[PDB]
C-alpha cells in the first residue's frame, strides 16, 4: 500500500497514467489490501482518470461511482463522473453532478464551465451565460473560458433566430463580434474555432438584411488587421475592401463573410469546404460569376482532399446548376448515395429537374420525398408549384396553405407564395367585408408579409402585394411607409439605367399612393 501509493504518485506526476492504472488495478485485484482500501479512494480514482484520458468514457463511470461510494467528499471524483456522463449522452445527470461538485467546493472554476456547457447542450442559455460571464470575470486570462462564452453566445443567437426572435439575434451577434474582437486584440490567441464562430455569426446579418446597417464595421477592421490560389478569382482582399467605393451594404457584408473562411486532410477539406460555402452564399446573394468560379474551385479542391462527404457534393451540385445539368445530376446522385437519410438532396434534384422544365421527373421525386419526410414544408411547396404550372388552382392553394402551416415562419418562400396565392384568390372574387374567413386570411397574409420584410426588404413584388393587402385591411398607416419605401426604390432604380419604360409603373404606384393618402 505505502510503496504502492509512492509508485502511483510518482507515475501520476510524470504524468503517465497507463502505468498508474496498471499498478492500481494490480493492487485492487490482489485481494491483499482489504482494510486499507475502505478509508481511501485514490486507486479507483486513478483507474477512472486513466480511462478518462484514454477516451473510453463509459468504462470509467463505474470506477468513479465506486470511488465516490468509498469517499463521498471527493470533488475530483464528482468532476470526473460528470465529464464521463457528458460524453455518454447523459447531460442531465452530468448537470446534477456538476451542481453537487459546485456545492461541495464553490471556488472550483472548471466545474462551473462544464456545467455551463451542459446547460447550453440542453438549451438553458440564461443560466449558462450567467455562469460563463461570472467565470470570465473571475479569471480573464484563460482562453478556453472565453472561447466557451463565445460559443454559448453564438448557439443562443442561432437558437433565437430559428425560434423567430430576429431582433435579439442581431444584438447577441454584435455582442459575439465584440467579444471576438476583445479576444483577438488582447489575448492575441488565434484558432480555427473562433473564426468558424465569427463566420456563423456573420451569416445572421446577411440573413436579417433589414438590420444589416448595424454590422460593427469598426471592430471587424481591427479583427482583420491584427492577424493565394483562390484570391485571383474573387479578388477579395483587405486592402481592396478598405479602398472601395460605390459598394452596397449587403455586398460589404458578404465580403466580410468571405474573410473569416480564408483567415482560419480532414481539417484542410473542412477549410476549403467552408470557403466554398461562403462563396456560394455570396454568389446566391449577389449573382456575380467570379463568386461561382471561386466556389467551384474551392469545392473541387475539397473533393480532391477527401471526396467522402455528402455536403461537398451537394455544394458542387448547387454551384453548377445552370452551367450544366448533367454535372448537377451526377453530384446530387453521388450525395444521395453517400448519405441516404438526408432529404435535401432529393429536393435539390427536384428543383434542378423543374429548372429544365421536366415536370414528370419532378413530380416523381417529390412523391418519393413526401413519402420520406412528410413534416418538411419544401416538398409541399414543390408540388404546389408543379400544380400551379399545370393549371389546377384548388389543389395548389391547399398545398400552399399546408406548406405555410408546416413552415412555422422558418421559410421566406412559403410566406411569399402563401401571400401571393391569398391575394390572387381574393382580388376579384366578389366577396363582402363581413366574411370572417376572408378577413382572417387577409390578416394572416399581412402578418406573413410583415415577417417576410424583416429578412428580405426592398422587394418590389412583395411590397406591392403588401400595399394591396393593407389597403384591403384599412391599415393606412403601414401602407404609407411601405409606399414611401417603394417609391424610393423605384426612383433609385430608374435614376441609374436612365431608362423610360419605368414610367408606366410609376403612374400606378403614384395612384396607389394617392389612394393611401
Amino acid at each position: 500500500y505505502t510503496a504502492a501509493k509512492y509508485i502511483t504518485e510518482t507515475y501520476a506526476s510524470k504524468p503517465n497514467w497507463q502505468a498508474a492504472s496498471s499498478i492500481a488495478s494490480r493492487l485492487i485485484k490482489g485481494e491483499k489490501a482489504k482494510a486499507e482500501l475502505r478509508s481511501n479512494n485514490w486507486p479507483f480514482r486513478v483507474v477512472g482518470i486513466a480511462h478518462l484520458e484514454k477516451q473510453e468514457e463509459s468504462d470509467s463511470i463505474e470506477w468513479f461511482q465506486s470511488a465516490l461510494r468509498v469517499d463521498p467528499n471527493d470533488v475530483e471524483s464528482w468532476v470526473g463522473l460528470g465529464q464521463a456522463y457528458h460524453a455518454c449522452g447523459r447531460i442531465e445527470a452530468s448537470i446534477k453532478v456538476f451542481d453537487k461538485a459546485i456545492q461541495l467546493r464553490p471556488s472550483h472554476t472548471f466545474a462551473q464551465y462544464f456545467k455551463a456547457i451542459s446547460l447550453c447542450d440542453v438549451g438553458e442559455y440564461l443560466e449558462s451565460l450567467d455562469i460563463l460571464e461570472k467565470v470570465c470575470q473571475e479569471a480573464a486570462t484563460e482562453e478556453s473560458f472565453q472561447i466557451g462564452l463565445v460559443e454559448v453566445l453564438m448557439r443562443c443567437s442561432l437558437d433565437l433566430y430559428s425560434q423567430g426572435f430576429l431582433l435579439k439575434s442581431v444584438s447577441i451577434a454584435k455582442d459575439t463580434i465584440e467579444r471576438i474582437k476583445i479576444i483577438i486584440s488582447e489575448l492575441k490567441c488565434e484558432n480555427q474555432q473562433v473564426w468558424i464562430y465569427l463566420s456563423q455569426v456573420l451569416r445572421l446579418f446577411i440573413w436579417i438584411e433589414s438590420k444589416v446597417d448595424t454590422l460593427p464595421v469598426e471592430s471587424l477592421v481591427s479583427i482583420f488587421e491584427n492577424s493565394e490560389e483562390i484570391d485571383s478569382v474573387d479578388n477579395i482582399k483587405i486592402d481592396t475592401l478598405l479602398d472601395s467605393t460605390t459598394d452596397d451594404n449587403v455586398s460589404i457584408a458578404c465580403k466580410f463573410l468571405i474573410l473569416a473562411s480564408k483567415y482560419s486532410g480532414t481539417v484542410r477539406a473542412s477549410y476549403w469546404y467552408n470557403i466554398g460555402i461562403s462563396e456560394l452564399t455570396a454568389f446566391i446573394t449577389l449573382k456575380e460569376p467570379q463568386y461561382r468560379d471561386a466556389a467551384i474551385f474551392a469545392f473541387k479542391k475539397s473533393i480532391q482532399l477527401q471526396s467522402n462527404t455528402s455536403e461537398t457534393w451537394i455544394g458542387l451540385g448547387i454551384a453548377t446548376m445552370d452551367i450544366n445539368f448533367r454535372v448537377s445530376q451526377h453530384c446530387f446522385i453521388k450525395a444521395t448515395a453517400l448519405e441516404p437519410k438526408a432529404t435535401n438532396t432529393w429536393f435539390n434534384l427536384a428543383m434542378l429537374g423543374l429548372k429544365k422544365k421536366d415536370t414528370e421527373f419532378a413530380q416523381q421525386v417529390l412523391n418519393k420525398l413526401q413519402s420520406l419526410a412528410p413534416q418538411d414544408s419544401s416538398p409541399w411547396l414543390g408540388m404546389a408549384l408543379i400544380l400551379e404550372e399545370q393549371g389546377d388552382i384548388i389543389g395548389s392553394s391547399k398545398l400552399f396553405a399546408h406548406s405555410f402551416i408546416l413552415s412555422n415562419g422558418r421559410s421566406k418562400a412559403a410566406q411569399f407564395m402563401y401571400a401571393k396565392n391569398v391575394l390572387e384568390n381574393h382580388i376579384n372574387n366578389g366577396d363582402d367585408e363581413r366574411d370572417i374567413e376572408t378577413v382572417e386570411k387577409l390578416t394572416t397574409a399581412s402578418i406573413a408579409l410583415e415577417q417576410f420584410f424583416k429578412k428580405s426588404p426592398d422587394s418590389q413584388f412583395a411590397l406591392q402585394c403588401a400595399l394591396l393587402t393593407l389597403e384591403r385591411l384599412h391599415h393606412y398607416e403601414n401602407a404609407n411607409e411601405l409606399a414611401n419605401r417603394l417609391i424610393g426604390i423605384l426612383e433609385k432604380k430608374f435614376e441609374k439605367t436612365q431608362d423610360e419604360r419605368e414610367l408606366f409603373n410609376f403612374a400606378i404606384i403614384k395612384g396607389q399612393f394617392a389612394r393611401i393618402h
Binding site: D213, V217, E218, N249, I252, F494, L503
Partner: peptide, 23 residues
C-alpha cells in the same frame, strides 16, 4: 427633387461611409 419626377413633369452606403471615416 428627383430625376424620374423631373422627367415625368417634362412629359406632362452607411457601411461604406463608416469604413472610409474609420480608416
Amino acid at each position: 427633387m428627383s430625376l424620374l419626377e423631373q422627367l415625368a413633369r417634362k412629359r406632362i452606403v452607411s457601411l461604406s461611409l463608416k469604413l472610409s471615416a474609420l480608416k
